Write a protein that binds this ligand. Sequence first.
Ligand SMILES: O=CCCCC[C@@H]1SC[C@@H]2NC(=O)N[C@@H]21
Ligand SMILES: [Mn+2]
Ligand SMILES: [Mn+2]
Lengths: 562, 261, 41, 131, 166
Amino acid sequence: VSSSKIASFSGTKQLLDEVGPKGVAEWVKKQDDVLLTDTTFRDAHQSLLATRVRTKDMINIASKTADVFKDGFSLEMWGGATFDVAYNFLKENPWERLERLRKAIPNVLFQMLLRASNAVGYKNYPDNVIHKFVQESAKAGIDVFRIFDSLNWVDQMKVANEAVQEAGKISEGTICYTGDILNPERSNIYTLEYYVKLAKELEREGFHILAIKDMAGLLKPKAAYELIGELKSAVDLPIHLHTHDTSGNGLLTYKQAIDAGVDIIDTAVASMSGLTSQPSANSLYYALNGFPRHLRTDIEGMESLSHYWSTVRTYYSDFESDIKSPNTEIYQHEMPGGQYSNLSQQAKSLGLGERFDEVKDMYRRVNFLFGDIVKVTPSSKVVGDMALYMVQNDLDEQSVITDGYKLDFPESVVSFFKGEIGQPVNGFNKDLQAVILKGQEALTARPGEYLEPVDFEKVRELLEEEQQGPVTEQDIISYVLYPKVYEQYIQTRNQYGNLSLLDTPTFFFGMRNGETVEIEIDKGKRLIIKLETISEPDENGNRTIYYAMNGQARRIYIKDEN
Amino acid sequence: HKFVQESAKAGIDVFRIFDSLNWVDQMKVANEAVQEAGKISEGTICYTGDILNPERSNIYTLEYYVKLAKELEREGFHILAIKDMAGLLKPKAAYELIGELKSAVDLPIHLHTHDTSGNGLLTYKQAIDAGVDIIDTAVASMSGLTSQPSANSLYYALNGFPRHLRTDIEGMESLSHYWSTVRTYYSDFESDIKSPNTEIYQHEMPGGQYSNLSQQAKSLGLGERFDEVKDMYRRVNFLFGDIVKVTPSSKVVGDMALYMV
Amino acid sequence: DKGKRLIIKLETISEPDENGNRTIYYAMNGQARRIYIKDEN
Amino acid sequence: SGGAGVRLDAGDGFQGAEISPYYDSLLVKLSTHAISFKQAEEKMVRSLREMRIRGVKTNIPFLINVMKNKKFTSGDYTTKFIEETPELFDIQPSLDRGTKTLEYIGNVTINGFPNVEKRPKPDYELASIPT
Amino acid sequence: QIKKLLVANRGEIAIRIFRAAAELDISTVAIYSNEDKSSLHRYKADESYLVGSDLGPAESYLNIERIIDVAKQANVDAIHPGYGFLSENEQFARRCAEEGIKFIGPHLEHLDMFGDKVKARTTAIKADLPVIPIDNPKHIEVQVIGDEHGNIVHLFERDCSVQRRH
Ligand SMILES: O=CCCCC[C@@H]1SC[C@@H]2NC(=O)N[C@@H]21
Ligand SMILES: [Mn+2]
Ligand SMILES: [Mn+2]
């Protein structure tokens, strides 16, 4: 779609400019139609393709997405696993993704998923790291921050909320769904009144939008009716539903939440949707025909977007999961997202592949052992690691106490009982906890409290001394989040440059003889590379590559690794 | 006759009888064979068009199906079957269609759909509120996309709603796991489809057809203009006067579409 | 001949092509030089 | 080429261009320059004789053959020149040793020698040759 | 006052002009046909655009309309046609000025003044030079460079008498 045409659209982006965060929410509330947030750029491929999708594949349909989602509520396109992965595996800069997309899709709000304690990081950070990250993310184009917490501990959500409010952007306060409100015997704790009392709380904390995060796709169709009906009379906040289709019940849940008055839902493009992804927006659009509320979208554009991602998804087939059918066992174990697969590719690497059965079974039990907890990253990693360990050592609800003194529990568990991931809803069994800590003290306050503020001065002078000189705010905050992984990006970038410009089949597979490949640099100016031949190896094992780059004959030397 | 008799004898109890153009006069012969064999005769209506949408057809209306159902009740089928061979039955439509027929005819209603749009389950949900007696499902690992909607899924989907599926889920998860492995032996034969697809509503190709018809479009020279074949398949439907599409009628339209591009 | 002589480096020979022809890359008296060899069987 | 009096304007030729049948084939524009006209001619012929273009035929020899011609050196020439000078077309290909020898080595390297088994190539005593 | 320059051409004259342009500190655009994806001249400018997938080998450099978008797309404000496609063409020239783009050739009236045969003949007689009917002929031509200010020098002659029919 032409940039001229895109320059003329007004959507939720320029709404935020004119009326501010409280004005956007107000305006969500008055819409009859269900508004949609597309998740193709984050959660769709985070679930289906190990977060591997590359900027280049997104940049390519950005102008079509700007047109197609013009009436969307937001594009969820940053956060989750995408920061780390981009730097680490794709060896590309997730800030360049943010800013290049920002320019191409000027019209629709940008959403990211922001974990309360540590943003997008992997450990715990002092408060001035959270603030720095949100300052810079907002500057770079993020408009809606979906602040969530692994354990639904509200105290841990405040710092991020403050940041977003200061940035003048939209904070969504997230509740994560577990248990089953349809079933009194599932749980005492995770009852309908518990969600109400916690909605009512996030609202007193100033969040503009309320999000129900159903991360293990556990929210049954009727429960979605009940839950959203109660929340809508319990609070003034627009409600924004997020779920996964892993049970195969994603659409029905979305339908029911719609009958019950939900404001925004998260869907994906068809080709990128379903099973562990979100339910398909293309399907829902048709599913609502002849019911009271309509999905606000362009299906013709969506069918066209889906065709694009059909082909691109092909580029990523080495990263597909085994999962090829819905799974209703999730209702028993509650394994959020990918985990079920991330955790069998791991039970095999330990000669347990043959009894992932008993592992599925221990996961559930462990959950009640740790006193019934919300299982998103990283609490799902705590529960998983404990299940592996406990199957492998032939362990018991009782053996874990009796024999705990000599036991040696996986780090991620000691760290949960130490308070380092926050406080569960139901506390810690004190005896379970003693036997795992083996003496060390638990935290009282939220983890971040205990942390020396970071000194960005020292970081800047360390990067400038390492790199040539001139270093930016994004660089500095990136390094604080991912020290090792950031340094590995610079080294890679010195050796090889800006690789996010290659297309994906070239980035993963290289080229073949006779192949010619164009790399777009600017508008109208591309690197034309064609491979004449590959030689045999010299004495010190170097093969010589014979290119014709931009017509010019050219010769490169690569050490063969065998 | 010789086939129904032998079939009965050998253990078949329920015959679902359909015609590829919904021509009742062509079903009477198999029905008489089934009646004579003391077995259950299921009278199939194939769904096309789209009864929510008056623009779609003056012909395939709620009234066409009601009329067609009573005619089947008169020839003495014991069950009424709705074959949604392409999964064209949108949720609200199933609710409305099962409604009418439950007050039109004293026949139990048996519903068969395919999950190719992604809405299969939603359809069954809706038909169930409308009074429907039997639905077609498959185990989870054998379901989805161009197959039936998942029995396991439907089971938990209906928690808190008035009716429920009469089945054993824990047994189903077991069935599911077994087939999940077996499916593996058959990988060389796996559909190319991996997504739900709502263009189904515009071109109406049944079952797997739109990937066979895409093989074929490539094995010629039209892979790039497959968008033109989908379009011709549609137009060729109206050219032929707007017809039901199941084997072998759907091949006719596919064959014609190939020919015309 | 007397004080004129050919200096040839064979740098690489390529995998063949449909037409059935290998490409030999040489250097000859200071020149890049490419040659097409038909490959019988 | 290059050097005194030579000017070159790139056309289609380089490295390993394919030239196509779609456009006027022009590989290089070659101009030369001196104070004498003869001197510019003998400059042209130097330069023409330097060029190596391989993989395609070219018009170099014809061009050499107009340059060398007394009746073009004389200056007194009319647009009837080429038509009433038939011997411009008298073109011997010389025994381009270099090319031929690469063809032979290539051929043997790939398809071996008749009566001779494919082994690791000798010249395998560093005892050189008494003289 | 020319910030960037598109050449409606290929090959030597394209390269030639690209170089002139580089010398005057001017950003340059090249156009190519599908058959010229790897022609030298595509490489020797700063900017390169396809005249369009659907345009054949001959057409690419002769589509007045299509060339001019490439132009407007690249914020270009001058085109040099070189020689031998649209360099003599009356319509292409007219089009350029219309789109705001400066045609590097003579004025609009010159092209059809000289482009037709029968009309050239009239022009010359209006400034009287010779014409009517050719033994041992010599082909002689005179280079002229005039500005837009009635200052018009000549750069002496050449001698193109060495030819085969065309
Ligand atoms: O087919 C084998 C490769 C060709 C080698 C040609 C050489 S030239 C001298 C001798 N005479 C021939 O007939 N072949 C070899
Ligand atoms: Mn999620
Ligand atoms: Mn069927």
